[PDB]
Amino acid sequence: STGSATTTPIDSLDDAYITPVQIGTPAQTLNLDFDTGSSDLWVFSSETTASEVDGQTIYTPSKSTTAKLLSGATWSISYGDGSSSSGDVYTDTVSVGGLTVTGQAVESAKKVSSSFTEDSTIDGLLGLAFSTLNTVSPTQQKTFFDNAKASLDSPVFTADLGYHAPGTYNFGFIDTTAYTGSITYTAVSTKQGFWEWTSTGYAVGSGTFKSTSIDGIADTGTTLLYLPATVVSAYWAQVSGAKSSSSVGGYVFPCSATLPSFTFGVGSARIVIPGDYIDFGPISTGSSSCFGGIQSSAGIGINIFGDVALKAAFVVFNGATTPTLGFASK
């Protein structure tokens, strides 16, 4: 089997991407944030505290003839941005782009933190990291990809995120028309539950490539590119007037600037992030200070190849017995 679904930016900055997902019988379509940095499929629901729902579409398990309470199971998750959610668990039929999994754990939110409530465009998350990170207790549950894998033509999914435009998530096949050149594959460590890999270095603009190992995670659920302070300082030093602002929470730059590109290494291959992809616009409405799309990971504990980096590539998440990642230009 295969599936193919379009993913759409939630706003003019590409802060996140939403993909329609069919849950239950008859189908209830919710727009979920596909997140290769976490491993829970959770949704706003008829159980979510009413004051914490503000415009989202909800899953109502009582209206699904295939929903079943997973008795005793609870979940609770905290994300790197400080947001969180928790609740109980149903199993139900879940389809993405024509690919159907029966018995998928659908984690129904009873509580969500303010950032989720405040984003009316995201109805929940669909985790695509390794199932060892799934938070359901006392019986850990599998991701949608893990459940679908055996049925797929090939045990893979691909992320093809657009810059200011829709893109595609494919399951079970690699669309050879969706990228240019060849795909370069690189090793993955699953030890932390992430799609964790080692970039071979970087360049700033037209500068020379610096060969240096940068361990990090491929995370579709993180907006920006978070890298070591040395790398980030070298990038922003090429932008007149750029500075790190403790009050804003990262590097800012004059909105009048033209930003240089940023290149990262994948083995001997190179992925080029155009300068425009690094512009996240005014820090507040009408400001002439703009927020940078490359930020330091020094306070995180891990480097994160988020959407800024991934949208410059066609990315293969290879879930073979030994997982690997592939990157191609596009």
Side-chain angles (χ1 to χ4, degrees), residues 1-62 64-67 69-109 112-141 143-148 150-190 192-242 244-330:
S1 62
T2 64
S4 183
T6 300
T7 194
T8 302
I10 65 165
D11 62 24
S12 65
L13 298 178
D14 298 346
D15 282 316
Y17 298 78
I18 49 171
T19 308
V21 178
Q22 282 71 49
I23 309 177
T25 308
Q28 301 179 39
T29 298
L30 275 64
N31 296 327
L32 305 189
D33 182 353
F34 283 22
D35 180 13
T36 62
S38 69
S39 305
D40 288 50
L41 192 176
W42 74 259
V43 297
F44 279 79
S45 75
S46 60
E47 301 180 330
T48 310
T49 300
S51 64
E52 296 180 349
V53 183
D54 184 9
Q56 295 80 12
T57 295
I58 63 167
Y59 168 59
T60 303
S62 65
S64 173
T65 61
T66 43
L69 179 73
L70 187 61
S71 183
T74 59
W75 62 280
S76 182
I77 193 161
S78 308
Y79 296 101
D81 66 353
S83 69
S84 63
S85 52
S86 62
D88 56 17
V89 187
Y90 294 82
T91 57
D92 210 339
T93 301
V94 172
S95 301
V96 175
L99 169 65
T100 300
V101 167
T102 58
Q104 175 63 46
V106 177
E107 299 173 35
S108 168
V112 305
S113 69
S114 60
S115 63
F116 289 116
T117 300
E118 289 162 3
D119 186 359
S120 66
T121 71
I122 292 175
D123 303 324
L125 267 64
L126 190 149
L128 294 166
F130 292 89
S131 292
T132 54
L133 292 180
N134 176 266
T135 78
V136 177
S137 182
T139 306
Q140 187 171 64
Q141 300 295 304
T143 68
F144 175 83
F145 178 54
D146 218 332
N147 282 323
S151 302
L152 294 178
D153 290 357
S154 183
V156 305
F157 69 91
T158 64
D160 178 10
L161 302 179
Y163 168 65
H164 294 352
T168 305
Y169 281 102
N170 291 329
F171 291 84
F173 73 105
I174 288 161
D175 180 356
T176 60
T177 73
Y179 59 88
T180 64
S182 53
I183 307 177
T184 298
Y185 289 87
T186 196
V188 164
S189 175
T190 66
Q192 296 190 87
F194 300 122
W195 293 91
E196 187 172 2
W197 65 289
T198 302
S199 172
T200 51
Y202 69 98
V204 176
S206 59
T208 62
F209 187 84
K210 175 73 169 177
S211 292
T212 185
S213 296
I214 306 171
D215 180 288
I217 67 168
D219 184 1
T220 58
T222 289
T223 313
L224 305 185
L225 174 54
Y226 294 88
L227 291 173
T230 49
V231 178
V232 177
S233 184
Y235 177 81
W236 290 109
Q238 297 305 310
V239 179
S240 290
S244 182
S245 166
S246 57
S247 61
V248 173
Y251 280 91
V252 296
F253 68 94
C255 292
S256 59
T258 303
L259 296 178
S261 63
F262 184 88
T263 300
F264 64 94
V266 183
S268 57
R270 306 289 180 253
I271 299 296
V272 178
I273 306 172
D276 288 352
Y277 290 26
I278 299 161
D279 180 6
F280 279 75
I283 60 173
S284 297
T285 304
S287 176
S288 72
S289 291
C290 273
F291 197 67
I294 296 178
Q295 298 292 344
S296 179
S297 64
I300 297 180
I302 198 157
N303 299 307
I304 306 173
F305 293 86
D307 298 332
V308 163
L310 302 181
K311 76 178 70 176
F314 177 89
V315 188
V316 181
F317 294 79
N318 170 28
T321 302
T322 298
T324 65
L325 279 166
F327 292 83
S329 295
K330 65 184 185 193

